[PDB]
Design a protein around this nucleic acid. Structure first.
Ligand SMILES: [Mg+2]
Ligand SMILES: [Mg+2]
Ligand SMILES: [Zn+2]
Lengths: 136, 135, 66, 94, 176, 38, 134
RNA sequence: AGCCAGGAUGUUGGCUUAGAAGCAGCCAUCAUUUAAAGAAAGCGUAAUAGCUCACUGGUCGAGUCGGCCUGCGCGGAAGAU
């Protein structure tokens, strides 16, 4: 369950999620799961997808998580009225824009890499795709 | 290239073996076990017989260069062409005994360097003598 | 036997049938002849005698409470 | 051995570039050396297949514009963030 | 459709009547009549039949391919016959015929009496098998299917009515 | 029959067929593989 | 119509022998003496395959095969086990010279007429069983 | 596509295992015969057996096989007068 060890502020504004993504290219491994849609990846969703693919690769090769949940999401408790200050932080998400590489792996065959990424993407709330490292 | 060049290669050695061979027998080998065919192949090798099954389309053009264009005529059905180099007939005799022993092994056509001997006349080559008889 | 989690240690055939030797817990071998007859049309028989001890699985040990 | 056909762009700018990308072409630039830079427009599919091969970024490319040939090398490629498409290419005269 | 490319060769002694989409075939076995689809054009060539798609029909070749199969089956049915073999598996199941009517004992509290259609005949060489003879492939297939559906074969012991050509996939029971 | 949103070939002997605008997976080797989309 | 692999000189003891022919309905004593004849004529104490092909018409035929290459090579290397990791452990050493006699022994079983081909096949088996071949 | 054949020999590869014989799992990964046959992609067996597939030959006589973008559709889709 990824989470910032310390933060300068406990809570932050809702903000927006406009624009396209940085970190488009495959930088560490050989294969990658790149997002196509946009949305929020919860720490729970990220760590679940990691488990899903690390069990599929039989602990072979290396896996990199290119995203990190660092935006705290607050939630008011049930049966409370509006106002009286901002709600308490409940979970952390990572804002995602199209073209963002989320996971990366190397040291496994491509055919198995696609299966691992398929099983991982089955756990993700946003559309994804499979990409391979390119030479530019 | 690829399988086409593979056919280009395949036709070459069979054409050259037909050049270097003495007698030719082509027979039907349908419904025969591999463990029975392997014994036929060992027997043929022990007596100087080269027998190979190839595609009929390839083999017509393989034997066009060879003397038996007469043999080329029929080439219908499964075909195991046998080149009786060494004593002229070691293949025909074996094919006759394998026929009565293993049914479905049909002798069909055969070649006596130019004349097309049918299945009813293979006995001439089956009964030929050995070459070293001048003594 | 495998469903009864009994390690099989032998499958000696015979002119009559087949003799099978295994090691199975006493507690889970309870009521075995009925099922044996059901599986073999009542055309089989078994003899059983205590052999040794082994550690019970954690779920069984947790269930055992006094 | 890698040869490409291209045309000199008539209008530069974001709107024109998007017009080309919609029209199945895409722009590229050629610079380097004494000559002034040359903005070119070229088919997307042909270059996509050419770039598919890893050697596209190793050998010397040839570009045919206005019936004359220029020796270049691929310097930088801008790809579509998620779609398998090329946005832009940088060529340096070889 | 390249089944429809292949022509159907009508044999001797068989007449073909074509009235547009409606055709009639008569042979030594019997008579059949069928109304073809409007999207298929049939032509009686020189002692053979040809099929094609009409113009202005999206279906076209598929309909022509279906039509060829139907006419080929009709020709076979009028020249030779169509036969089906049914086998009864069980302790007490038996069958008999009384003139286009099969009486069956299929382990029921009542006898089963099936009345055949017009051009179907049934004979019982034994009490455990049935031979159905006809000219219409679809009709004889339907009759065999109905006879099977009276007592579909049973997965644990094969008890029921099956086809002789049929292989029944059995099963096993561990009796809990 | 398994009525699911996701119907798939569970084995080589499974075949996908559309029958009434409805997708059905039929298996000649295993009844448990028979599925309908719904 | 069956098959077996009774050890040499062990037809008299009937642990799986008696059962096998017992179901078929064949007399053990007659098979025993006949098998024993060949099993004693050869190195006693070795798994020797036998194609006991009794025709259901109360026939009695048997064709003993050459002992398997596995046991031949493991005895030649003086090992009573096998390579768990044929690529890594690779234990038990043999000799190219030692491949010729067993090749001659089993030449009656294979099809190729080349003795070197026979040795290449048995050493292909040797690499599978992880034997140190020079 | 289909249809007719073959689909093998060391060998039951080795380890492990009650059993592991192509098909529990773990390490390879051959040669031989070939037209071709995987130290096996399935089903099946306690294990065998058996039924296949890949592959190859025969037959047939014209096109055929998949992957990528993209348009419009299909199911997913149950409420109360
Ligand atoms: Mg604008
Ligand atoms: Mg098994
Ligand atoms: Zn299935």
């Amino acid at each position: 369950m990824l989470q910032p060890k310390r933060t300068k502020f406990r809570k932050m504004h809702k903000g927006r999620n406009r624009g396209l993504a940085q970190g488009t290219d495959v930088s560490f491994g050989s294969f990658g799961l790149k997002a196509v849609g946009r949305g929020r990846l919860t720490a729970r969703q990220i760590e679940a997808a990691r488990r899903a693919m690390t069990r599929a690769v039989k602990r072979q090769g290396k896996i990199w998580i290119r995203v990190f949940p660092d935006k705290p999401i607050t939630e008011k408790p049930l049966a409370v009225r509006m106002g009286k200050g901002k709600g308490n932080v409940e979970y952390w998400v990572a804002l995602i824009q199209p073209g963002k590489v989320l996971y990366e792996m190397d040291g496994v065959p491509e055919e198995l890499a696609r299966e691992a990424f398929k099983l991982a993407a089955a756990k993700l709330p946003i559309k994804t795709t499979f990409v391979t490292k390119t030479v530019m | 290239a690829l399988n086409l060049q593979d056919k280009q290669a395949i036709v070459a050695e069979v054409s050259e073996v037909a050049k270097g061979a003495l007698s030719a027998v082509v027979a039907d080998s349908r419904g025969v076990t591999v463990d029975k065919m392997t014994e036929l192949r060992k027997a043929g090798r022990e007596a100087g017989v080269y027998m190979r099954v190839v595609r009929n389309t390839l083999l017509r053009r393989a034997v066009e260069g060879t003397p038996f264009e007469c043999l080329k005529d029929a080439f219908v059905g499964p075909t195991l062409i046998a080149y009786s180099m060494e004593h002229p007939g070691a293949a025909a005799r074996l094919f006759k005994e394998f026929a009565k022993a293993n049914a479905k092994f049909e002798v069909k056509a055969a070649a006596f360097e130019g004349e097309l001997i049918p299945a009813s006349q293979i006995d001439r080559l089956a009964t030929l003598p050995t070459y070293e008889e001048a003594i | 036997l495998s469903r009864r989690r009994g390690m099989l240690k032998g499958q000696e055939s015979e002119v009559t049938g087949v003799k099978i030797h295994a090691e199975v817990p006493l507690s889970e071998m309870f009521g075995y002849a009925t099922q044996l007859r059901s599986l073999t049309k009542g055309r089989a028989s078994y003899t059983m005698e205590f052999l040794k001890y082994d550690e019970a699985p954690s779920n069984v040990a947790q269930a055992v409470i006094e | 051995m890698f040869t490409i056909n291209a045309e000199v762009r008539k209008e530069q700018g974001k709107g024109a570039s998007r017009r080309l990308r919609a029209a199945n072409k895409f722009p590229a630039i050629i610079y380097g050396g004494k000559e002034a830079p040359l903005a070119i427009e070229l088919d997307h599919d042909k270059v996509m297949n050419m770039q598919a091969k890893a050697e596209f970024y190793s050998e010397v490319l040839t570009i045919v514009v206005d019936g004359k040939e220029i020796k270049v090398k691929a310097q930088d490629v801008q790809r579509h963030p998620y779609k398998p498409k090329l946005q832009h290419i940088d060529f340096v005269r070889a | 459709s390249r089944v429809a490319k292949a022509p159907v060769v009508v044999p001797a002694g068989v007449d073909v009547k074509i009235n547009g989409q409606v055709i009639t075939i008569k042979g030594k076995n019997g008579e059949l009549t069928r109304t073809l689809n409007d999207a298929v054009e049939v032509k009686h060539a020189d002692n053979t039949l040809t099929f094609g798609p009409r113009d202005g029909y999206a279906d076209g070749w598929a309909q022509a391919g279906t039509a060829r199969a139907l006419l080929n089956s009709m020709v076979i049915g009028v020249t030779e016959g169509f036969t089906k073999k049914l086998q009864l598996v069980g302790v007490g199941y038996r069958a008999a015929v009384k003139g286009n009517v099969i009486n069956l004992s299929l382990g029921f509290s009542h006898p089963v009496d099936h009345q055949l259609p017009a051009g179907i005949t049934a004979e019982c060489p034994t009490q455990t098998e049935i031979v159905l003879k006809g000219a219409d492939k679809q009709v004889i297939g339907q009759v065999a299917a109905d006879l099977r559906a009276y007592r579909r074969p049973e997965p644990y012991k094969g008890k029921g009515v099956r086809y002789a050509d049929e292989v029944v996939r059995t099963k096993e029971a561990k009796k809990k | 029959m398994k009525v699911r949103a996701s119907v798939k070939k569970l084995c080589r002997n499974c075949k996908i067929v559309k029958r009434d605008g409805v997708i059905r997976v039929i298996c000649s080797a295993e009844p448990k593989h028979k599925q309908r989309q719904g | 119509y069956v098959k077996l692999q009774v050890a040499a000189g062990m037809a008299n003891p009937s642990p799986p022998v008696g059962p096998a022919l017992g179901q078929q309905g064949v007399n053990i004593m007659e098979f025993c003496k006949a098998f024993n004849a060949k099993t004693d004529s050869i190195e006693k104490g070795l798994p020797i395959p036998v194609v006991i092909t009794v025709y259901a018409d109360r026939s009695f035929t048997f064709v003993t095969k050459t002992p398997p290459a596995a046991v031949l090579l493991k005895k030649a290397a003086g090992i009573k086990s096998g390579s768990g990791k044929p690529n890594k452990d690779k234990v038990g050493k043999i000799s190219r010279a030692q491949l010729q006699e067993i090749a001659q022994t089993k030449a009656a079983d294979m099809t190729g007429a080349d003795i070197e081909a026979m040795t290449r096949s048995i050493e292909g088996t040797a690499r599978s069983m992880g034997l140190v071949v020079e």
